[PDB]
From Swiss-Prot, chain A:
Family: Belongs to the TRAFAC class translation factor GTPase superfamily. Classic translation factor GTPase family. LepA subfamily.
Function: Required for accurate and efficient protein synthesis under certain stress conditions. May act as a fidelity factor of the translation reaction, by catalyzing a one-codon backward translocation of tRNAs on improperly translocated ribosomes. Back-translocation proceeds from a post-translocation (POST) complex to a pre-translocation (PRE) complex, thus giving elongation factor G a second chance to translocate the tRNAs correctly. Binds to ribosomes in a GTP-dependent manner.
Record organism: Thermus thermophilus (strain ATCC 27634 / DSM 579 / HB8)
Cysteine disulfide partners in this protein: none
Gene name linked to the record: lepA
Subcellular location: Cell inner membrane
Protein name per UniProt: Elongation factor 4
Swiss-Prot record, chain B:
Assembly behavior: Part of the ribosomal stalk of the 50S ribosomal subunit. Interacts with L10 and the large rRNA to form the base of the stalk. L10 forms an elongated spine to which 3 L12 dimers bind in a sequential fashion forming a heptameric L10(L12)2(L12)2(L12)2 complex. Contacts one of the L7 dimers. Interacts with RF2 (release factor 2).
Family: Belongs to the universal ribosomal protein uL11 family.
Keywords for the protein's UniProt record, in alphabetical order: Methylation, Ribonucleoprotein, Ribosomal protein, RNA-binding, rRNA-binding
Known role: Forms part of the ribosomal stalk which helps the ribosome interact with GTP-bound translation factors. The stalk extends beyond the surface of the 70S ribosome and is preferentially stabilized in 70S versus 50S crystals. In the 70S ribosome is in a position where it could interact transiently with the A site tRNA during translation.
Matching Pfam families: Ribosomal_L11, Ribosomal_L11_N
Changes after translation: The protein probably contains twelve methyl groups; at least one lysine residue (Lys-2) is known to be trimethylated. Methylation of the protein is not required for function.
Cellular component terms (Gene Ontology): cytosolic large ribosomal subunit
Source organism per UniProt: Thermus thermophilus (strain ATCC 27634 / DSM 579 / HB8)
Family matches, as NCBIfam families: L11_bact
Species lineage: Bacteria, Thermotogati, Deinococcota, Deinococci, Thermales
SS bond list: none
Protein name: Large ribosomal subunit protein uL11
Record HAMAP family: Ribosomal_uL11
PROSITE patterns: RIBOSOMAL_L11
Curated annotation (Swiss-Prot), chain C:
Gene: rplY
Subunit-level organization: Part of the 50S ribosomal subunit. Contacts the 5S rRNA; has been isolated in a complex with 5S rRNA and uL5, 5S rRNA and DNA binding protein II; 5S rRNA and uL18; 5S rRNA, uL5 and DNA binding protein II.
Entry function: This is one of 3 proteins that mediate the attachment of the 5S rRNA onto the large ribosomal subunit.
Gene3D superfamilies in alphabetical order: Ribosomal protein L25, beta domain, Ribosomal Protein L25, Chain P
Biological classification of the source: Bacteria, Thermotogati, Deinococcota, Deinococci, Thermales
Protein name per Swiss-Prot or TrEMBL: Large ribosomal subunit protein bL25
Native organism: Thermus thermophilus (strain ATCC 27634 / DSM 579 / HB8)
A GO cellular component annotation in the UniProt record: cytosolic large ribosomal subunit
Domain of life of the source: Bacteria
NCBIfam families in UniProt: bL25_bact_ctc (TIGR00731)
Curated annotation (Swiss-Prot), chain D:
Pfam families, alphabetized: Ribosomal_L16
HAMAP family for this protein: Ribosomal_uL16 (MF_01342)
Cellular component terms (Gene Ontology): cytosolic large ribosomal subunit
Keyword RNA-binding: yes
Protein name in the entry: Large ribosomal subunit protein uL16
Domain of life per record: Bacteria
NCBIfam families attached to this UniProt entry: rplP_bact (TIGR01164)
Species the sequence originates in: Thermus thermophilus (strain ATCC 27634 / DSM 579 / HB8)
UniProt cross-references to SUPFAM superfamilies, sorted A to Z: Ribosomal protein L16p/L10e
Functional summary from the UniProt entry: This protein binds directly to 23S rRNA. Interacts with the A site tRNA.
GO MF annotation list: rRNA binding; structural constituent of ribosome; tRNA binding
Annotated gene: rplP
Record keywords: Ribonucleoprotein, Ribosomal protein, RNA-binding, rRNA-binding, tRNA-binding
Length: 76, 139, 185, 141
């Protein structure tokens, strides 16, 4: 059966019965400059997320951006 | 108002999304980044796919320029043996193949490139592209 | 192919004392002769590392009596791993049992998987006349999977040149080649 | 780890470690041997410690020929027990190794590779060692 809750995780129904789950993955926009992107991106490879695209804002050239979907826990 | 360029990349054919590294220096461009999929996948809807390199250069008033090349010897052979992926473990594991002419007709496709104006020299490298993925050449 | 080495005769000299002065005891022999001889170590080492017991070391005896010999056996100091004393068989003309090297011509199919070509014999035994010393002898290893065995009964055989050892004798195998993936069991 | 699948006598007298080897003083299977310089008792688990380090090192490839086998039981008394009262009880196996003994032999491996395997293996061992390459003397034997 389907099931909504609970905020404090331990409870949730046994893997005997459990075929679905949800990590309220947001994707976030980070302005950054220049490249911190290499460092950053990989970081967002551990706390796994999802690139859409985004854009360079104009310069300062170190002007730049990134829109990523990552699960709430990993993100924090 | 960003300075001129001399960009050195290596981008594939078809998959043309603004996703990097079509950006980290191609934003130092204001790069007309969708000009790729049009001007490039028009002449190169004749090969099919594969990484065709690109040397783009920006200038003063924020615009670009490039003249690309040709798709891998690991592509033109993959279609001529019914292969997507190579063979996992080359040298011993053969999946599909290519004849002495099917290797010659490929040098035909990538000749305005390398260095040798030979068909005897060029296809060797193509014949060298053979074992590299495990595709056998019929004697 | 065939070599030359400068033997000197020896009498009652104490073996250990020859040895002391870099010289190596020996004795040459056949149906007819049998004479106490010595040879220089370094001279013989070079010659032997090259010649082994397959070819023909010719002996520069100290009287122009030059002799054509084959090394029948070298006796080693078991401990500090040096040779101690050679034997020299003098060749005649009746065919002589001796050892001819093997050439495993080709790379097997077993390697070309990961295997190991285990060369059981790096030489064979045949009665042949001293005229015809086929200093190599080759084999078709090229057609070899893993779990593949080759026996002397194949084997080309020159002119001609009789297998001393019974044809069922095994000379070659390709074998599984370790694996850390094994082991952990 | 190696040990006689079965035997006749459970324990056996220690003996003495005198002389040089009685046999197997020459490389006779592979292309590269490890040879022994001091005499000692090499213990079932050392041989294994040494084999493994080479396999782990070759990782896939080569053959390993191990030419000592441990068939001498090695006895011990329980801790804190007193003298006498009987002979100890078997606690493992050594093989008896005496200088000039070819212990291991690797094959189908690059010279670079072998001598780094046979070298590590020799660190596992309780004695002093020398690596060697199937001469020609060893073919004359
Ligand atoms: Mg010497
Ligand atoms: Mg002990
Ligand atoms: Mg004891
Ligand atoms: Mg005891
Ligand atoms: Mg007692
Ligand atoms: Mg040691
Ligand atoms: Mg014997």
């Amino acid at each position: 059966g389907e099931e909504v809750e609970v905020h404090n995780p331990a409870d949730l129904p046994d893997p005997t019965r459990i075929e679905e789950i949800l990590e309220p993955y947001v994707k976030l926009t980070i302005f950054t400059p220049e490249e911190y992107v290499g460092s950053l991106m990989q970081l967002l490879q551990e706390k796994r997320g999802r690139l859409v695209n985004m854009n360079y804002l104009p310069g300062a050239q170190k002007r730049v951006e990134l829109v990523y979907e990552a699960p709430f826990a990993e993100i924090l | 108002k960003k300075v001129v360029a001399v960009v050195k990349l290596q981008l594939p054919a078809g998959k043309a999304t603004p996703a990097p590294p079509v950006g980290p220096a191609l934003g130092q461009h204001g790069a007309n980044i969708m000009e790729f999929v049009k001007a490039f996948n028009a002449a190169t809807a004749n090969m099919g796919d594969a990484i065709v390199p690109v040397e783009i250069t920006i200038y003063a008033d924020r615009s670009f320029t490039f003249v690309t090349k040709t798709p891998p010897a690991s592509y033109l052979i993959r279609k001529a043996a019914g292969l997507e992926k190579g063979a996992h473990k080359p040298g011993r594991e053969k999946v599909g193949r290519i004849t002495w002419e099917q290797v010659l007709e490929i040098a035909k496709q990538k000749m305005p490139d390398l260095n040798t104006t030979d068909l005897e020299a060029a296809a060797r490298m193509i014949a060298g592209s053979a074992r590299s993925m495990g595709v056998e050449v019929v004697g | 192919m065939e070599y030359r080495l400068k033997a000197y005769y020896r009498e009652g000299e104490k073996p250990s004392a020859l040895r002391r002065a870099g010289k190596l005891p020996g004795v040459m022999y056949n149906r007819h002769l049998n004479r106490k001889v010595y040879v220089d170590l370094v001279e013989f080492d070079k010659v032997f590392r090259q010649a082994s017991i397959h070819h023909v070391i010719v002996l520069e005896l100290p009287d122009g009596q030059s002799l054509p010999t084959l090394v029948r056996q070298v006796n080693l100091d078991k401990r500090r791993r040096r040779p101690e004393h050679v034997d020299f068989f003098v060749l005649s003309d009746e065919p002589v049992e001796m050892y001819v090297p093997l050439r495993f011509v080709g790379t097997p199919a077993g390697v070309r998987a990961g295997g190991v070509l285990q060369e059981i014999h790096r030489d064979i035994l045949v009665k042949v006349s001293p005229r015809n010393i086929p200093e190599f002898i080759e084999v078709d290893v090229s057609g070899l999977e893993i779990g593949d065995s080759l026996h002397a009964s194949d084997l080309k055989l020159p002119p001609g040149v009789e297998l001393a050892v019974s044809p069922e004798e095994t000379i070659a195998a390709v074998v599984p080649p370790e694996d850390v993936e094994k082991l952990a069991e | 780890m190696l040990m006689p699948r079965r035997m006749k006598y459970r324990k056996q007298q220690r003996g003495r470690l005198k002389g040089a080897t009685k046999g197997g003083d020459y490389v006779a299977f592979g292309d590269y041997g490890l040879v022994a310089l001091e005499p000692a008792w090499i213990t079932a688990q050392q041989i294994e410690a040494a084999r493994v380090a080479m396999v782990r090192h070759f990782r896939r490839g080569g053959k390993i020929f191990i030419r000592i086998f441990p068939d001498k039981p090695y006895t011990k008394k329980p801790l804190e027990v007193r003298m006498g009262k009987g002979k100890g009880n078997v606690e493992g196996y050594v093989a008896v190794v005496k200088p000039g003994r070819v212990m291991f032999e690797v094959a189908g491996v690059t010279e670079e590779q072998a001598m780094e395997a046979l070298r590590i293996a020799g660190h596992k061992l309780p004695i002093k060692t020398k690596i060697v390459r199937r001469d020609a003397y060893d073919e004359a034997q």
